[PDB]
Amino acid sequence: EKVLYVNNENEPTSFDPPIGFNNVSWQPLNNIMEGLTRLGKDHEPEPAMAEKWSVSKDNKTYTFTIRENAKWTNGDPVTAGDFEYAWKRMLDPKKGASSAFLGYFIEGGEAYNSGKGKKDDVKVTAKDDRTLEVTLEAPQKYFLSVVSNPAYFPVNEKVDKDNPKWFAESDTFVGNGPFKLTEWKHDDSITMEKSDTYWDKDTVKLDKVKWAMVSDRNTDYQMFQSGELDTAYVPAELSDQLLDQDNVNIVDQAGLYFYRFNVNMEPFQNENIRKAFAMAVDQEEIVKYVTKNNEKPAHAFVSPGFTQPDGKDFREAGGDLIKPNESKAKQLLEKGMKEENYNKLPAITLTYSTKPEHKKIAEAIQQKLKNSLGVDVKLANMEWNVFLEDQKALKFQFSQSSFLPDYADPISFLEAFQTGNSMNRTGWANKEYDQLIKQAKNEADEKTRFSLMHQAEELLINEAPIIPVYFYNQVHLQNEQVKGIVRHPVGYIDLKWADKN
């Protein structure tokens, strides 16, 4: 019996597909449920519940054909109606799903979700049991990746009306993915087994996947050492000894660790002062001496992890947009302080959320700004929830930031810095940038759309409302016997191609 032993760390928030909206829920859920597409080993969407699709001449209307022999674990066929049901449920104004915004891509979805528009005017329709027609608000070539997201998973409508809490327990769960949920001991473990009803069961080579719930990183390592976990985190303490070994897996995760300025709070209303701070930071030093998990230093906003029409990575094709340079940074600071008539900089506080990682990086930033520019910043820390909310409320001059994209396209990053966007949180308000984003969202030629997005990024970095620090990755110790795990830059772990031999 081939059993893959992994650690989920904690109890899933929810297996009701649109609700969890996080790794602890969606990493396992992705392996017991299945959407119209699934991201493959090269991260491109491939046919999953949909055998095939056609797109209308205006690029707005998709017609999915459901696989003829797709089934639920209770033997029921997976139908286009199960998708219509699920997507309208995900958008329901009364359900308050945290992932509902991803449903806004469907025409009528945002209006329905707002309480303004009718359910029937949301353009997802089961034309028959095998045919799902979907009309988008606007053409998006990456919609085929969006429908691999768990928010877009189907729900067996008969099962949901019979037991509206079917997803809360293994014994009532009805799923359609490569594995079947067979045990769920809340706060302890999950077990899933190769699913006999699955259309592609012959591809699935693991008999079972077992998911622990161990949040103690120290116990996580002991369990790897002892063979009780097949995958595990690299202990930070022992990074320098272990990171070089052949059993460490490192892959991209799209996302960015950065700092935000508030461009309306002194002294960061001055572009030269922001640019000086941004150019003083040395991201190579942070990753080499502080984080020490082989993260890529960030010299741009959009991370590795997005493919272009030519097959290149977006970040690789755009290049570095800000280069560390101490002597130039000093000149820019001196120029900005002269513009503002500052004899000394106004007091600056660097605020972060309480966590050891964040404190170490903030202390390194503080020391670097002192050594390279002669500037003093004070540190402040507070609990995550209050920190996050105060950041949204633009309370902080200078604050730790994290961004993870919601979907597999660079526009997910770049739309964040439009004027007044909820993910902006800096006050930065650039009409030229806003126009470029608008043009990108209305551009039919993908190569030109990608150019517009590079143009936008260059303008953002040039005005420095942020300081990029590092790009996210996924680092694991992995049993040499285990092959074929797929961890996507944008999306959730896929185990259906994994083997243990």
CATH code assigned at 306:
3.10.105.10
Q: What are phi and psi of 376, to 5 degrees?
A: -105, 125
> Which of 109, 153, 99, 97 is CA-nearest to residue 135?
109
- Cβ neighbours around 288 below 10 Å, total: 13
Q: How far apart are CA 123 and CA 406, in angstroms?
A: 22
Q: Is the peptide bond before 267 cis (omega within 30 degrees of 0)?
A: yes
Structure tokens, 483: 């092959």
> Which of 465, 446, 450, 146 is CA-nearest to residue 315?
450
The strand pairing partners of 190, in sequence order, are: 184, 211
- Cβ neighbours around 444 below 10 Å, total: 10
- Cβ neighbours around 302 below 10 Å, total: 29
Q: Compute CA distances 328 → 46, 178, 196, 277, whole Å.
A: 48, 55, 64, 11
Residues with Cβ within 8 Å of 418's Cβ and at least 6 positions away in sequence, in order, are 424, 433, 434, 437
Q: How far apart are CA 186 and CA 8, in angstroms?
A: 12
- Cβ neighbours around 354 below 10 Å, total: 12
CB 301 within 8 A of CB 322: no
Structure tokens, 115: 């309480």
Dihedral (CA of 27, 32, 35, 37) sign: positive
Burial code (b: 16+ CB inside 10 Å, e: under 16) for 485-499 equals bbbbbbbbbbbbbbe
Residues with Cβ within 8 Å of 289's Cβ and at least 6 positions away in sequence, in order, are 364
Structure tokens, 65: 């054909």
Distance, CA of 469 to chain centre: 17
For β-strands 45-47 and 61-66, DSSP reports them as unpaired
Q: How far apart are CA 121 and CA 111, in angstroms?
A: 9
The strand pairing partners of 377, in sequence order, are: 348
Structure tokens, 306: 């997005």
Residues 371, 320, 377, CA angle at the centre, nearest 5°? 25
Q: What share of the chain is helix, strand, coil (3-state, %, to 5)?
A: 35, 20, 45
Q: What are phi and psi of 39, to 5 degrees?
A: -70, 130
Q: How far apart are CA 109 and CA 92, in angstroms?
A: 9
CB 247 within 8 A of CB 232: no
For β-strands 61-66 and 50-55, DSSP reports them as antiparallel
Q: What are phi and psi of 441, to 5 degrees?
A: -75, -10
- Cβ neighbours around 327 below 10 Å, total: 8
Amino acid at 142: Y
The strand pairing partners of 381, in sequence order, are: 352
> Which of 351, 367, 357 is CA-nearest to residue 292?
357
Amino acid at 492: Y
Residues with Cβ within 8 Å of 125's Cβ and at least 6 positions away in sequence, in order, are 84, 132, 133, 134
Helix (H) or strand (E) holding 372: helix 356-373
Q: Compute CA distances 368 → 272, 343, 403, 457, whole Å.
A: 18, 21, 23, 25
Q: Is 252 left (phi over 0), alpha (psi -120 to 50) or beta?
A: beta
CB 11 within 8 A of CB 186: yes
- Cβ neighbours around 436 below 10 Å, total: 23
DSSP-H helix ranges across 256-342: 271-280, 283-285, 314-318, 326-340
Q: How far apart are CA 16 and CA 34, in angstroms?
A: 13
Q: What are phi and psi of 307, to 5 degrees?
A: -95, 145
Q: How far apart are CA 373 and CA 280, in angstroms?
A: 7
Q: How far apart are CA 199 and CA 136, in angstroms?
A: 29
Helix (H) or strand (E) holding 411: helix 411-414
Range of the domain at 449: 252-474
326-340 helix and 271-280 helix, angle to the nearest 10 degrees: 160
Q: How far apart are CA 179 and CA 30, in angstroms?
A: 9
> Which of 418, 409, 407 is CA-nearest to residue 465?
418
Torsion of CA 333, 469, 317, 327, to 10 degrees: 30
Length of the chain: 501
Dihedral (CA of 219, 223, 229, 231) sign: positive
Residues 56, 57, 61, CA angle at the centre, nearest 5°? 25
- Cβ neighbours around 114 below 10 Å, total: 12
> Which of 230, 254, 201 is CA-nearest to residue 43?
254
Amino acid at 211: W
Dihedral (CA of 338, 344, 346, 351) sign: positive
- Cβ neighbours around 133 below 10 Å, total: 16
CB 218 within 8 A of CB 209: no
Q: What is the separation, in whole angstroms, between the first and last Cα of the chain?
A: 11
Instruction: Report CA Rg, the chain.
Output: 24
Q: How far apart are CA 350 and CA 361, in angstroms?
A: 11
Q: How far apart are CA 501 and CA 480, in angstroms?
A: 9
Q: Is 34 left (phi over 0), alpha (psi -120 to 50) or beta?
A: beta
Amino acid at 124: V
Helix (H) or strand (E) holding 356: helix 356-373
